[PDB]
Structure formats: C-alpha cells, structure tokens
Write a protein that binds this ligand. Structure first.
Ligand SMILES: [Cl-]
Ligand SMILES: [Cl-]
Ligand SMILES: [Cl-]
Ligand SMILES: [Cl-]
Ligand SMILES: [Cl-]
Ligand SMILES: [Cl-]
Ligand SMILES: [Cl-]
Ligand SMILES: [Cl-]
Ligand SMILES: [Cl-]
Ligand SMILES: [Cl-]
Ligand SMILES: [Cl-]
Ligand SMILES: [Cl-]
Ligand SMILES: [Cl-]
Ligand SMILES: [Cl-]
Ligand SMILES: [Cl-]
Ligand SMILES: [Cl-]
Ligand SMILES: [Cl-]
Ligand SMILES: [Cl-]
Ligand SMILES: [Cl-]
Ligand SMILES: [Cl-]
Ligand SMILES: [Cl-]
Ligand SMILES: [Cl-]
Ligand SMILES: [Cl-]
Ligand SMILES: [Cl-]
Ligand SMILES: [Cl-]
Ligand SMILES: [Cl-]
Ligand SMILES: [Cl-]
Ligand SMILES: [Cl-]
Lengths: 60, 60, 60, 60, 60, 60
C-alpha cells in the first residue's frame, strides 16, 4: 500500500502493520489537510475534527 | 456499505438496493456539500451541479 | 452592517456599498443553502435558484 | 498594511477598514495554518481553535 | 501588555516590570512549547534550547 | 504495545523491536515533557535531560 503525505515527494510506502491511508481535517475547513499518511486503526472523529481512512493506493 | 451524511452522527448504514455513496456540490464551492448519503443510480452532472459516486465505506 | 456566512468565523462586516445580507438556495436541494453573505442588489429568483435578502445584522 | 495569505503570491494589501492580519490553526497542530489574511475584529478562540491577530506588515 | 500561556484561559496580563512576552522550545520540536508567558530579560539561546521574545499583545 | 504521544491522535502502536514506552523532560522546565513515544533501550539520564520508561499500554 502506497499513500499520500503532506510534504514533497507527496507519497510514500506504508510499513507492514500500517494498512490504512488517512487524512485529518477541521470539519468546517475540508480543503486544507492538517495530517496525511499511513496508520493501523482509524482514530475517532468528533464534531470539530474529522479523520478519513481508506485502503486503495493514494486514496487519501 | 456505510456512507457519510450531513446530520449527526455523520454516517449511516445503507438499506437494501442502494450500493453506492455520493456527494452533491455547486461548481466553484467544493467546501459546502448540499446533499450526502446512499444512492441507487449515480446522477448525471451539468455545468453548475457536480456529483461524485463511490463504492467503499465512507468514501464520500 | 454584519451578515452571517457559511465558512469560519461564520460572520462578516460588509464593505461600504453593500447594504443587504442574502441567502442562495438551489431548487434541487431545498434544505441546504449554498451561500450566505453581503450584496448591493437582490438578484431575481429563477427556475433553478432562489434568493432571499434582508437589511439588519445577522438576518440571513 | 500588508499581510500574508495561503496561496501564491503569499502576500496582499488589506482594504480600508480591515486593519489586522490573522492566522487560524488547530491548537494541537500549530505548524499548519488553515486560514490566513486581513480582518477588522479578531474572532474568539476556543479550546480546539486558535485565532492569532497582529498589526505590523507580514506578522501573520 | 497581554501574553499567551499554557494554562486556560491561555492568556494573562503581565505585572509591573515584565515588558516582554516569550516562548521556549527544544530544537527540532517547534510544535511543543515547554514555557510561555511574561518575562523581564530575554534569555540567551543554546544548541538545544531556543527562546524567542516580542513586545506586542499575544505575540508569543 | 501501545504508548501515549503528545501529537494527535495522542496514542501510537509501536513497531516490532520497540518494547518500552518513554517520557523525556528537560531539567530547565520540569513540569512539561518534550516527547512521549516508543523505544527499544531506555537512555541514561544526564545533567540536562531526565528519562522514564515503562512496559504496559499507555503507561508513559
Ligand atoms: Cl507487522
Ligand atoms: Cl469532508
Ligand atoms: Cl505516516
Ligand atoms: Cl509510516
Ligand atoms: Cl456495512
Ligand atoms: Cl438512504
Ligand atoms: Cl446524456
Ligand atoms: Cl466550467
Ligand atoms: Cl463557464
Ligand atoms: Cl457594522
Ligand atoms: Cl466585494
Ligand atoms: Cl444552514
Ligand atoms: Cl459576501
Ligand atoms: Cl462582500
Ligand atoms: Cl473604510
Ligand atoms: Cl500557537
Ligand atoms: Cl482576507
Ligand atoms: Cl481582504
Ligand atoms: Cl494590557
Ligand atoms: Cl508573570
Ligand atoms: Cl554570551
Ligand atoms: Cl543546529
Ligand atoms: Cl548539530
Ligand atoms: Cl498492541
Ligand atoms: Cl522506528
Ligand atoms: Cl503533559
Ligand atoms: Cl515514537
Ligand atoms: Cl516508534
């Protein structure tokens, strides 16, 4: 699995065990990602914060 | 299949016969979705109204 | 004059020359306005879009 | 007064009436600005959201 | 003079004799401030410990 | 093993080979740790930095 990240080169390969791509944003400002990378379990979203997780190459 | 929605808790399980997730927005205003949920047939887009459809959990 | 908006901080002071607040809604999705802001002339409503205008702080 | 903004050219001149530069961030992620520009009054911060305001050229 | 601090409500008014605001961080960890408040003399930095000092409201 | 961290989401699963959780604190600012994470060997404390290590989920 390959996922997008914030800084150049903008992509990376995930380690064994981290099999999800994720993106964190402010729910009120969906166009600016704050964190972007590989993870093992999807974190809990809240009213103000959203975590999106997916498992297809460069889906995040 | 689970899809994102506008009302708390912000997700729902789709009923029998809806096998896609979707999002509806106005051209040049991508940060304000006006419709978000489960659907049967993906609608056709026009100059002002844009639709996106997908088939994995909370992809919309 | 100060009007409501859909993007943070959810309020805005209008420039001199814009003395009305407004709301814009698409007929295809009547429960969710696509824009809230300041304007100089209230636009005529059409077959696809409805407009509502008012003149006091946070009326829209 | 001149202030920084998010997209290229990364700077701009403020209108008359907007005499403060601002930056909005998630309190837990101080290195990624979500919004950046000119404003008239500083918005209220909260536990999760911080607004920083200043009035010297390119202070934000 | 008002300065930012780590404890809620996240700001304080400085007492007589403290005419500067400051922030203390470790090199390569700018997102975790370990000290933040009002001060008299700005301390000298070293290889691992970095200090910044300023003189306008909530500049730190 | 799962350890606490200072950056969102405030928890992390350690890679195979890292079987301890730790906390790092500078003697110049004893009330605020600068880092929390996973490690393989607990480092010796020095004149400037103190280290604490433990072996169970979210102990650090
Ligand atoms: Cl593994
Ligand atoms: Cl979103
Ligand atoms: Cl990552
Ligand atoms: Cl990784
Ligand atoms: Cl399901
Ligand atoms: Cl449905
Ligand atoms: Cl057609
Ligand atoms: Cl077009
Ligand atoms: Cl066009
Ligand atoms: Cl006003
Ligand atoms: Cl305008
Ligand atoms: Cl609304
Ligand atoms: Cl407007
Ligand atoms: Cl306007
Ligand atoms: Cl003016
Ligand atoms: Cl900050
Ligand atoms: Cl602006
Ligand atoms: Cl402006
Ligand atoms: Cl003061
Ligand atoms: Cl003090
Ligand atoms: Cl010296
Ligand atoms: Cl160095
Ligand atoms: Cl070095
Ligand atoms: Cl574990
Ligand atoms: Cl590692
Ligand atoms: Cl702590
Ligand atoms: Cl770590
Ligand atoms: Cl690690």
């Amino acid at each position: 699995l390959k996922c997008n990240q914030l800084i150049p080169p903008f992509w990376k390969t995930c380690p064994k065990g981290k099999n999800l791509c994720y993106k964190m944003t402010m729910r009120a400002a969906p166009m600016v990602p704050v964190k972007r990378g590989c993870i093992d379990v999807c974190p809990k979203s809240s009213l103000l914060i959203k975590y999106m997780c997916c498992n297809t190459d460069k889906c995040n």
